[PDB]
Amino acid sequence: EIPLKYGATNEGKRQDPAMQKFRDNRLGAFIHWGLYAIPGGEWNGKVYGGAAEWLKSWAKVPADEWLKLMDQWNPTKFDAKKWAKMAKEMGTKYVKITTKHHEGFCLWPSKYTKYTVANTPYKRDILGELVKAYNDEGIDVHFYFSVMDWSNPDYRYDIKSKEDSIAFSRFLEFTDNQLKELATRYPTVKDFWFDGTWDASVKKNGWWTAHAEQMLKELVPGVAINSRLRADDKGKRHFDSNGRLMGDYESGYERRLPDPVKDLKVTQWDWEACMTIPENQWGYHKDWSLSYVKTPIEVIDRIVHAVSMGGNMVVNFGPQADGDFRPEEKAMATAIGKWMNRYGKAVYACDYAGFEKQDWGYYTRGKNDEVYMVVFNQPYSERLIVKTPKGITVEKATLLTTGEDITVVETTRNEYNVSVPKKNPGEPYVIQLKVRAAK
Numbered sequence: 001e002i003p004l005k006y007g008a009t010n011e012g013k014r015q016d017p018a019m020q021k022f023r024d025n026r027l028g029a030f031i032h033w034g035l036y037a038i039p040g041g042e043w044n045g046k047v048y049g050g051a052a053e054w055l056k057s058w059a060k061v062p063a064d065e066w067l068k069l070m071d072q073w074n075p076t077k078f079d080a081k082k083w084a085k086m087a088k089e090m091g092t093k094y095v096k097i098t099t100k101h102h103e104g105f106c107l108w109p110s111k112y113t114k115y116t117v118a119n120t121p122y123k124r125d126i127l128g129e130l131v132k133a134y135n136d137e138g139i140d141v142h143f144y145f146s147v148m149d150w151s152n153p154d155y156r157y158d159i160k161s162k163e164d165s166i167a168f169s170r171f172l173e174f175t176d177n178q179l180k181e182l183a184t185r186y187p188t189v190k191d192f193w194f195d196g197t198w199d200a201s202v203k204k205n206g207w208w209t210a211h212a213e214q215m216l217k218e219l220v221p222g223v224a225i226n227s228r229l230r231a232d233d234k235g236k237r238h239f240d241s242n243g244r245l246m247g248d249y250e251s252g253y254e255r256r257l258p259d260p261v262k263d264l265k266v267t268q269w270d271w272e273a274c275m276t277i278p279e280n281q282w283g284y285h286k287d288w289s290l291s292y293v294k295t296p297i298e299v300i301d302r303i304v305h306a307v308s309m310g311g312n313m314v315v316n317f318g319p320q321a322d323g324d325f326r327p328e329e330k331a332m333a334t335a336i337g338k339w340m341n342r343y344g345k346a347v348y349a350c351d352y353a354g355f356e357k358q359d360w361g362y363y364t365r366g367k368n369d370e371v372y373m374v375v376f377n378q379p380y381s382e383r384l385i386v387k388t389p390k391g392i393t394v395e396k397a398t399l400l401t402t403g404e405d406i407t408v409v410e411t412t413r414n415e416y417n418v419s420v421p422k423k424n425p426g427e428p429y430v431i432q433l434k435v436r437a438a439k
């Protein structure tokens with residue numbers, strides 16, 4: 001056992017109503033919008049295949065020249081009420097917004113830097129408009145914040161001198177100022193999701209990460225803080241040197257997910273995954289033909305996968321420079337929305353069911369011990385295998401959409417065949433089980 005000043009604080013999972021809400025929400029959308037949307041992956045006539053929001057890096061653009069894009073920031077089609085309506089219709093319960101990405105341009109008019117929305121043709125507080133619009137739809141808002149900042153020359157990648165240490169100390173104060181500003185300007189915020197915390201400079205300054213967490217929790221009652229912020233005394237990130245989770249939820253599953261058989265450890269803490277639609281594009285990229293683009297069922301599979309293992313999922317969108325969404329993203333949101341409207345009782349407010357994974361799909365467990373079978377892979381056998389934990393029996397099965405009764409046949413002690421529906425649903429579908437535990 002190691003002694004630590006800046007390690008974990010939470011015992012197990014938070015069970016206050018604010019965390020229960022963060023959890024129960026389950027499905028969110030991510031918005032990556034920044035100056036990178038203007039060039040859209042292309043610089044000086046060359047299209048780069050890397051993530052469009054990192055184009056400054058790929059094309060080696062100096063900060064002064066990158067930040068001049070502010071002069072073209074004029075999203076005339078932007079309408080926050082329309083954005084919120086799109087998120088509502090998708091069935092998202094929350095949205096995570098890039099308040100500032102690595103480029104350093106702020107979507108709110110920060111008083112601590114000139115690189116903000118206020119100094120663009122458009123002038124308006126985008127972020128404030130979004131907060132208000134989403135909240136009006138009953139949709140929680142979470143703020144993405146990049147610690148790394150390519151616009152501020154006090155940023156350091158590592159501390160190699162006393163000069164570096166002085167500069168970086170200023171940078172942290174500047175960061176604290178932006179954070180307090182966001183918290184006090186927009187007090188309905190439910191979560192801060194830190195990114196760009198991987199450099200040695202941050203790892204060496206664990207104390208600050210713990211401080212940022214406590215500071216924001218004092219300013220916003222019940223606010224959530226992601227693990228990715230946090231580093232301990234020894235520079236160990238996410239989980240401290242005694243294996244304990246820092247922050248309120250685990251936040252490392254990015255464009256990947258834990259294995260449903262081998263990574264059951266994740267059910268012991270709250271966590272959230274995020275994903276892109278193309279292979280690796282978060283900001284708007286002009287050419288989606290350059291990598292594989294997921295279909296709606298592929299996205300829905302990942303969402304349900306997350307919930308089945310006790311985690312949330314956040315699907316990313318990268319709005320155009322003009323403030324509208326591309327057609328592929330509108331189609332996706334609409335498709336997800338249709339399916340969630342029909343089957344979302346197996347997603348919202350659900351969790352890990354404690355059953356052995358089977359090949360047909362995923363189990364989720366409801367708040368009143370409902371066990372849902374979410375079927376993505378239809379067996380030619382016409383039988384869905386259900387192996388129960390010790391002491392649990394299956395009393396009934398019901399097709400969720402129609403209420404029709406589904407035959408259940410005991411095959412062995414602790415195992416059943418649940419029939420497929422008489423008519424093939426023709427899409428991923430849900431069978432609800434009634435289970436009983438021995439007494």
Ligand SMILES: C[C@@H]1N[C@@H](C#Cc2ccccc2)[C@H](O)[C@@H]1O
Pocket residue numbers: 051053054195254274282
């Ligand atoms: C949520 C995503 N995190 C950002 C990143 C990254 C990254 C950078 C270097 C190596 C591996 C991952 C992406 O640009 C996006 O914000």
